[PDB]
Amino acid sequence: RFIHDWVYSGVFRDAYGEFMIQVKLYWTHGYVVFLKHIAHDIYVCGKTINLLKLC
Amino acid sequence: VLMKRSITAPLAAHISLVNKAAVDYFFVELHLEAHYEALRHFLLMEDGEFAQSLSDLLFEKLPGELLNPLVLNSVLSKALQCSLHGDTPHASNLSLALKYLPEVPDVLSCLELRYKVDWPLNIVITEGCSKYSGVFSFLLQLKLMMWALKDVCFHLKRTAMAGSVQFRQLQLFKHEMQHFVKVIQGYIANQILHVTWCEFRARLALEEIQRAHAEYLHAVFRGLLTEKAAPVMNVIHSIFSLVLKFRSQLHPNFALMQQSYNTFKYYSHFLFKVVTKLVNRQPHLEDFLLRINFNNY
16 A cells, blocks of 8 residues: 555555655665566656645 | 575566656656757767857956956857757756856866756756766866867968968977867767767666766767876866967067977977877777877877
8 A cells, every 4th residue: 555655646654664665865765575677767657746736 | 495585576577667757757758868969969068069169259358357257157048049049948957157267378267157957957967967067178278278279270371472481380380289179079078978978868768867968978088087097187278378469469479489389389289199008007098199190109
C-alpha cells in the first residue's frame, strides 16, 4: 500500500518508519532482498509526482 | 522459483508513462528548449552586436568609478537595446553583478554575469552549473584583445606622406600579432559553441536532464580551462600581455617596441612545442596544432 502511494497518488504515508524511505533543493527525502533494478526507480517515480503537485 | 512478476508488471507499465509525461511537460509548457538556446545568446556571447556592444562600452572607460550600481547596473539595460535579438521575458534576469573590488596594463578585469530562473526550472539547472561564470570571464577577456588591437589598427590610420622603412616594418607586427588572436578565437568559436552544441541538442530528443546538462557544460574541457591542460593556458597570458604593452606605445620609441615583438615571436614559437609534447599523453587538443600551425614549424 505504501508502495501503492508514490505510484498512484503520491501522498507519502509513514507511521513508525517501516518504510525504507523517510521525510531551492527540495530533494532531501533520504533513501538509504527485492530486485534493486526497481528499488532506486521507485524513489524517483514518487518525487516526480510530489513535484507536479506543487505546479 | 521466485519470479517477482506480480509486482513489477503492474508497476513498470506506469513508470514509463509518468516520466514521459514529466519530460514532455517541460518542453511543450515551460520551454526548457528555449532557456538553453537563450542563455547561450547572452552568457556564451553567441549573439553578436551584444558582446561587441557590452565589452565595447566597458572598455571605453579604462577604480571608484565603473564600480557603483549606477553605471554597470545600467550599462546592461543600455546594451540589450543594441542587441536586436531579445527583449523577451527570457532577456530579463541578467544581473550584471561583480565579485571583487579592484584597486588599480594587465589582461584581467573580474566581473560576473549570472542568469536567474524560477521554481519549476531551478530544480534542473543547478545553482552550481557558477561554471558559466568560469567560462565567461575568459571569453570576455578575449574581446579585450580584438578591441585594443583594433584600436592600434585604427590609431595608426590617422597617422597617414609618412612612408618609410620605420613605418611599414612596424605595421607588419600588428598583422603578425592579430592573426594569432584571430585563430585562437576561431578555435573557441568551433568547440564551445558549435560542436559541443551539436551534442546536447540532438542528444535530448527526468534524471537524465540533470546529467545531460552536467555533460554539456563540462565546454570547460575543450575550453582549455581544465587544470589538466593548465600549462597551455599559462602561456596564453604571456601572449595577451605583450599585445597590451604593444597598445601602450600607440617613431620616438620604435626600438622599445621592436624588442617587444621579438619576445612575442619567441613565446609563440614555444607554444608550438609545448602543445606537441602534450599529444603523447586528448583528442580535443589535436585540432589546436592544426590551427596554430599551417605551412610552418
